[PDB]
Each structure stands twice: as structure tokens, then as C-alpha cells.
Amino acid sequence: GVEVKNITFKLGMYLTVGGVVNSNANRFSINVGESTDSIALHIDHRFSYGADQNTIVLNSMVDDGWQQEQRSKNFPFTAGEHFQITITFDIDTFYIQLPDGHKVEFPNRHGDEAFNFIYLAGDARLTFVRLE
């Protein structure tokens, strides 16, 4: 999937990612981070994957290893359709704004003040990114 690299996504800014979920999707993820074998914020939108149905699984990855999962059952997404999510953060917490207006919080586990990449994975295509 699309990777947007060398971004300067700093404390207090807003990153919006828009796209279209594939018609026949198991899951897709948004992945934000600041170093090559790590992902500070992984947001996995699981229509159906593993033991999860219509569940968001959130995690982080440190040197290619997944950390502790968190889940949300707020799942305002439909296969084949557009979505948009916006992410902001402070030193302690990522704030993920879902398009139904629900907010998920996830810990800023590496204590980052800036990020330099975002990429999509899975059963969706990125159509736009905005950073300001």
C-alpha cells in the first residue's frame, strides 16, 4: 500500500487519511511511525480476521515485534466504501477521530513528539492524505 515518507507530523498537528475499502475486505490498517522497524500507531480495521469481526485492533510495533493489543467495537466502516480518519497526538496519547465522530485513544508508547511516515496496508486504497 501507499507509503507517505519524510513527513513532519508534529505534536498538535492533524493527519487525515482518506481512501476506499476494497469490496471484498478482511481488514486494512493505517500505520504511523518514526523509525524503520517500528510502528508507533497501528490501527487495524478488521471486518473479519482471526477471532475478530467488525473490530478495530490497535497496537504498536517495536523492532518488528507487536506489543499489547487494544480493541474497539466502534466500527463505522463498510467494505467497498470510502472512509476518512484523522489522527492527532500529544506526548501521552494518540487521538483517532473516526468518521462517525467516535474517538479512540491509544497510548503514545514511545513518547514521540513527531512522526515521519504513514502507510496503508491491507484491503483498501489510499485516495488522499492531508497534513497541517
Ligand X SMILES: OC[C@H]1O[C@@H](O[C@H]2[C@H](O)[C@@H](O)[C@H](O)O[C@@H]2CO)[C@H](O)[C@@H](O)[C@H]1O
Which residues contact ligand X (rule: CB under 6 A)?
Answer: 42, 44, 50-51, 57, 59, 66, 69
Residue closer to ligand X, measured from CB, 71 or 84? 71
Burial 82-116 (b: 16+ CB within 10 A, else e): ebebbbbbeeeebebbbeeeeebebbbbeebeebe
Taking the complex as a whole, how short is the minimal distance between the CB of residue 38 and ligand X, in angstroms? 13
Q: Is 36 in the site for a copy of itself (CB under 8 A)?
A: no
Distance CA 10, CA 60 (A): 18
Residues with Cβ within 8 Å of 98's Cβ and at least 6 positions away in sequence, in order, are 74, 76, 85, 104
Q: Is 7 in the site for a copy of itself (CB under 8 A)?
A: yes
Instruction: Count residues binding a copy of itself (CB under 8 A).
Output: 16
Does 8 bind a copy of itself (CB under 8 A)? Our answer is yes
Which spans of this chain sit near a copy of itself (rule: CB under 8 A)?
Answer: 1-8, 125-132
